């Protein structure tokens, strides 16, 4: 597994600041 995904996933979580109260339970929607 690529170690760059730690950063990419970490930055994605930071974006939850703008969607408080409606944060996705799972971003791997498929399945």
């Amino acid at each position: 597994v690529a170690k760059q995904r730690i950063r990419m996933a970490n930055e994605k979580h930071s974006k939850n600041i703008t969607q408080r109260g409606n944060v996705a339970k799972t971003s791997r929607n498929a399945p």
């Binding site: 597994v1 170690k3 995904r5 730690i6 970490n10 979580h13 996705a24 799972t26 971003s27 791997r28």
Partner: protein, 155 residues
């Protein structure tokens, strides 16, 4: 969610500290329902659990300074805290010298540059602190041979 169990299992499976376990903050629900090392191994394979890299401790700074010190920098009177003996013990200095000089005598005797009688005389002088270093001993042997040859010629 409370992922204390998953942090502990992943750490064991990765053979790292709990501080190097990275759980995906977007997938806590997925990671939350993994109560076995089998399922943790799956999440490690999937990429929801990753081992973070070691924190960098670079030796470049000290490697750079070690090069400077080899040239004599940062080694003056103002950069010494132990004694001359604590920094470089006299006994080690003497031990190296005797081995160096006794090794030379053995090779000169073996190679017949000197005889066992000259060797014995020089061995006890070497032990007597007559000769400071390899060269001083070698030049002295050269003078001895010249005189010995001159005496032989007349005889």
């Amino acid at each position: 969610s409370m992922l204390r169990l998953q942090k502990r299992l992943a750490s064991s499976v990765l053979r790292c500290g709990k501080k190097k376990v990275w759980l995906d903050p977007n997938e806590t629900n997925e990671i939350a329902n993994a109560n076995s090392r089998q399922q943790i191994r799956k999440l490690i394979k999937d990429g929801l659990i990753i081992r973070k890299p070691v924190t960098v401790h670079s030796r470049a700074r000290c490697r750079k300074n070690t090069l400077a010190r080899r040239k004599g920098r940062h080694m003056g009177i103002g950069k010494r805290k132990g004694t001359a003996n604590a920094r470089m013990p006299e006994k080690v200095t003497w031990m190296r010298r005797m081995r160096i000089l006794r090794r030379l005598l053995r090779r000169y005797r073996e190679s017949k540059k000197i005889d066992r009688h000259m060797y014995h005389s020089l061995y006890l002088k070497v032990k007597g602190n007559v000769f400071k270093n390899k060269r001083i001993l070698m030049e002295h042997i050269h003078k001895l041979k010249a005189d010995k040859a001159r005496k032989k010629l007349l005889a």
